[PDB]
Ligand binder design. Structure first.
Ligand SMILES: OC[C@H]1O[C@@H]([Se][Se][C@@H]2O[C@H](CO)[C@H](O)[C@H](O)[C@H]2O)[C@H](O)[C@@H](O)[C@H]1O
Ligand SMILES: [Cl-]
Ligand SMILES: [Mg+2]
Length: 139
């Protein structure tokens, strides 16, 4: 039941521990990239960036953008997306980190570099996907 990409999901009052964000969709055939951008105004608190061709390898890049400057990248070779295939990304907000799971398997955690979780009020979803659903609940 598509939404059009790029898609902005409002996070009113920011994020809080025990908040679970669920993204359903399908990777396009011959995808180059996916990006989730958790934004505090112009800053990017948490950038989650699967790259399907970085020097002919698949890698997940996580980072934070402060005052338009990217910080130190945390990379992950474990790559559970496939071109043409449906996925579920779950982002669980915990007190000290974002926890990410894809297709019900734990993938990575990302320690909070931005401390004002209550100001992370937008999630940008972009890249080579068909978007079915983006929602949140409290667990
Ligand atoms: O992936 C596609 C793009 O990637 C950036 Se990589 Se530089 C920078 O890195 C940040 C993470 O530290 C963010 O992922 C930015 O979006 C990216 O532009 C490079 O300029 C090119 O390869 C371009 O084609
Ligand atoms: Cl902060
Ligand atoms: Mg295939």
């Amino acid at each position: 039941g598509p939404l059009i990409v790029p898609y902005n999901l409002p996070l009113p009052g920011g994020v809080v521990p025990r908040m679970l964000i669920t993204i359903l969709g399908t990777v396009k055939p011959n995808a180059n990239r996916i990006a989730l951008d958790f934004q505090r105004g112009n800053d990017v608190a948490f950038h989650f960036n699967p790259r399907f061709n970085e020097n002919n390898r698949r890698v997940i890049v996580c980072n934070t953008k402060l005052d338009n400057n990217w910080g130190r990248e945390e990379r992950q070779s474990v790559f559970p997306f496939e071109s043409g295939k449906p996925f579920k990304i779950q982002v669980l907000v915990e007190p000290d980190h974002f926890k990410v799971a894809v297709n019900d398997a734990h993938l990575l955690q990302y320690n909070h570099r931005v401390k004002k979780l209550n100001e992370i009020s937008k999630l940008g979803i972009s890249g080579d996907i068909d978007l079915t659903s983006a929602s949140y609940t409290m667990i």
